[PDB]
Design a protein around this ligand. Structure first.
Ligand SMILES: Nc1ncnc2c1ncn2[C@@H]1O[C@H](COP(=O)(O)OP(=O)(O)OP(=O)(O)O)[C@@H](O)[C@H]1O
Ligand SMILES: [Mg+2]
Ligand SMILES: [Zn+2]
Length: 692
DNA sequence: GCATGCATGCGCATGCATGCATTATGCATGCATGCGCATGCATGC
DNA sequence: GCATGCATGCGCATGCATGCATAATGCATGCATGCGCATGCATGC
């Protein structure tokens, strides 16, 4: 006889029920503790409805049930549910008021083949698969214990159990003996949670030359909404045919359709630690060095992205004057400078970050529209990436390639911080409180130092004016820097084969610190110094007009304040002090100067050396001087000789003179500094020379 | 005139032609709209 | 004038409300007449 035939009869049913009850009551762990005791207790503490059982323990304790389990799942699961309900109701008597049924789910199993191997042999069996979710139908109320109203009299027919295979068709009304019709009593019916899922093979495991295959699954009761589309899951289920409509009859061959019915899915002190890290005096440098571990160099960009991530504070006196606190970032770089890796890292770190590209065929669009979704076939209003990132970050790649509509939408979202829609009878305004970070390339493919930033970029001045921070990444042949970058790249390639800052914080710790600072830190400007700010602003405007190009405006000051707030948010300071103000001054001055052309940039850099030297390193400046002299000598050698020489040498007197011009008189510490050795410089006193 | 016979008369059973009562479910068709395609018009540079 | 963008345009699939097609058997009632009974009329002797 078949396994299910022996299962059906009452004798072994009751015997197996008693065996399972004893297994539940007597099962203990490897340490002697009653597993089901603690399990049912923690289930009781939250009023849950499901119980989890391992096939390994079930096979170890009672082998016959484990053997019969794969080839007769439905009846055995029903018996186990009855036994578990009896045991639980014995433990606690109140569930008759709360929950009248408890489900039993199998957790572990011997792994079963993938979606390709499922064939006729696996029908009506227990299987376990792994796949990727592609769609979900939501939550649906299915019938259970249906009550029907007669339509001739008004009698209420008793509850009928709704099986998953066929619909319930009542025979006749017990009183008037009518044959129909009947309708469902909506008020007295009981309902169940139902959801449908489509699963596709993981693209990495598909052999070359064939395509991934998909199958459908059904989740019920507590399993609903346990998976998001695009995730990777593992199911334990029943491979089924016996549902009405599976046979193809209207035309074609007699082909059956298969469906899987699933029953399991397998995918305080921190505040004190945050405060302790804040107590450390150099937390700011730790955070600055913690950004983008995989990218070498570009320390200024990481420092700016720190403020961009931490953000500021909006201010709106009354309902009249709105001032944002989001610090936008724009990057312009020559090819090969890894602009996109920064955006990828930011998306990885940020809790809510949206990524899109202006070139085309983006997964998420940049404009709101109303459409019937291709997958769910529903009439939806799909807002752009700007709307979806409320209090989040929006990332745009290939900023220049955007067409007219994208530029218009971005301008509207940046200047008004709201998106207006008038389409298909729908008129709306949606909030776009988001921070914008963008990357782009110059017009000719290479940055021109003799032209302004606006002349080098395809964008317009109004769009550029919105961004608080502008960064320029220019590629220049430095042998030592190129050597280090190549070393890092080759090391990364070798490592991933299949066979200044003391210590950066952990990524999860950084996330927790960011969340805590955003939630509970609100620095106050009650200690600002207006005299110094006003004097510096006046002097900056004066010398900008003296040079005669791109004068400063009040907007920059606002950015400074925001940056100051961001810095005060880094140290968990509740009040703004002079250090944050000076750092924001340095950042704003660097951003403003870097956008000028050669002569103006040089003059401004020379004149404003006082402010730009805040918390700077003298050794770095001396290294810059040495690099400039080395570059001059190398250029002269290449132009005259026609080829480079084997050695580079430079007198110490020129370096000393330039340091005196910058008011530096001692260089022994620079000689003993690590920066001197890192660039493979040497100093010879026998000739008073520097060799590289 | 009294004794007897008896053709008439009445009520309840069965047999047989007409007549009376009952009664939801499953399958097919046209309207709306997505998706791939080629022609063609209009707009730049 | 030639190169490119693109709003308009067309044909065949599915999904969903209305609409279309099907289709004898069993049980009840009144008319005709047999069978037992008591009254009553008519006819003998
Ligand atoms: N400093 C760096 N550290 C690590 N990798 C780098 C660095 N600079 C460049 N790369 C590598 O250079 C490659 C160039 O690709 P990438 O997408 O990063 O370029 P991009 O700057 O976005 O260029 P494009 O202007 O073409 O969009 C990448 O594989 C990146 O890892
Ligand atoms: Mg890129
Ligand atoms: Zn009824």
């Amino acid at each position: 006889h078949s396994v299910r035939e022996w299962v059906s009869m009452a004798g072994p049913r009751l015997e197996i029920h008693h065996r399972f009850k004893n297994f539940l009551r007597t099962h203990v762990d490897s340490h002697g503790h009653n597993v089901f005791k603690e399990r049912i207790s923690d289930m009781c503490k939250e009023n849950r409805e499901s119980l989890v059982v391992n096939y390994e323990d079930l096979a170890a304790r009672e082998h016959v049930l484990a053997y019969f389990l794969p080839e007769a799942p439905a009846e055995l699961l029903q018996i186990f549910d009855e036994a578990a309900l009896e045991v639980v109701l014995a433990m606690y008597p109140k569930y008759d008021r709360i929950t009248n049924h408890i489900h039993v789910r199998i957790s572990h199993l011997p792994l079963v083949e993938e979606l390709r191997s499922l064939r006729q042999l696996h029908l009506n069996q227990l299987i376990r698969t792994s796949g990727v979710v592609t769609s979900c139908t939501g939550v649906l109320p299915q019938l259970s214990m249906v009550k029907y109203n007669c339509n001739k009299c008004n009698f209420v027919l008793g509850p009928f159990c709704q099986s998953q295979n066929q619909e319930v068709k009542p025979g006749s009304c017990p009183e008037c003996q009518s044959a129909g019709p009947f309708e469902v009593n909506m008020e007295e019916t009981i309902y169940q949670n139902y959801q449908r899922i489509r699963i596709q093979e993981s693209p990495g495991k598909v052999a070359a030359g064939r395509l991934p295959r998909s199958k459908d699954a059904i989740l019920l009761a507590d399993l609903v909404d346990s998976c998001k589309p695009g995730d990777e899951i593992e199911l334990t289920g029943i491979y089924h045919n016996n549902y009405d409509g599976s046979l193809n009859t209207a035309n074609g061959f007699p082909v059956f359709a298969t469906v899987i019915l699933a029953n399991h899915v397998a995918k305080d002190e921190d505040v004190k630690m945050i405060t302790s890290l804040s107590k450390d005096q150099q937390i700011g440098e730790k955070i600055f060095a913690s950004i983008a571990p995989s990218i070498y160099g570009h320390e200024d960009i990481k420092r700016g992205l720190a403020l961009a991530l931490f953000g500021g504070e909006p201010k709106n006196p009354g309902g009249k004057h709105k001032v944002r606190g989001d610090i936008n970032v724009l990057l312009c770089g020559d090819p090969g400078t890894a602009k996109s890796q920064f955006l990828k890292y930011i998306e990885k770190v940020s809790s809510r970050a949206i990524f899109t590209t202006g070139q085309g065929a983006s997964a998420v669009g940049l404009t709101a529209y109303v459409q019937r979704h291709p997958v769910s076939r529903e009439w939806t209003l799909e807002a752009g990436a700007l709307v979806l990132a409320d209090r989040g970050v929006c990332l745009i790649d290939e900023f220049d390639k955007m067409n007219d509509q994208d530029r218009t939408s971005i301008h509207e979202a940046m200047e008004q911080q709201s998106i207006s829609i008038s389409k298909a009878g729908i008129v709306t305004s949606l909030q776009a409180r988001c921070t914008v970070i963008a990357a782009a390339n110059p017009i000719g493919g290479r940055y021109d130092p003799s032209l302004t930033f606006s002349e080098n970029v395809d964008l317009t001045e109004p769009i550029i004016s919105r961004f608080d921070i502008l960064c320029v990444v220019r590629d220049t042949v430095d042998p030592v820097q190129d050597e280090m970058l190549a070393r890092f790249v080759v090391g990364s390639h070798v490592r991933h084969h299949p066979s200044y800052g003391v210590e950066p914080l952990p990524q999860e710790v950084l996330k927790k610190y960011i969340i805590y600072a955003k939630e509970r830190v609100h620095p106050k400007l009650n200690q600002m110094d207006q005299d110094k700010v006003a004097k510096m602003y006046s002097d900056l405007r004066k010398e900008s007009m003296a040079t005669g190009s791109i004068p400063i405006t009040v907007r920059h000051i606002e950015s400074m304040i925001r940056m100051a707030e961001a810095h005060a948010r880094i140290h968990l300071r509740d009040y703004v002090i002079e250090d944050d103000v000076n750092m924001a001054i340095r950042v704003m001055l660097e951003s403003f100067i870097d956008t000028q052309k050669f002569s103006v940039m040089r003059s401004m850099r020379k004149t404003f050396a006082r402010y730009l030297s805040f918390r700077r390193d003298n050794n770095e400046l001396l290294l810059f001087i040495l690099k400039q002299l080395v570059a001059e000598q190398v250029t002269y050698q290449r132009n005259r000789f026609g080829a480079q020489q084997d050695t580079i040498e430079v007198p110490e007197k020129d370096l000393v003179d330039k340091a005196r011009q910058i008011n530096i008189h001692n260089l022994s510490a620079f000689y003993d500094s690590e920066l001197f050795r890192m660039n493979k410089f040497s100093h010879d006193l026998k000739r008073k020379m520097i060799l590289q």
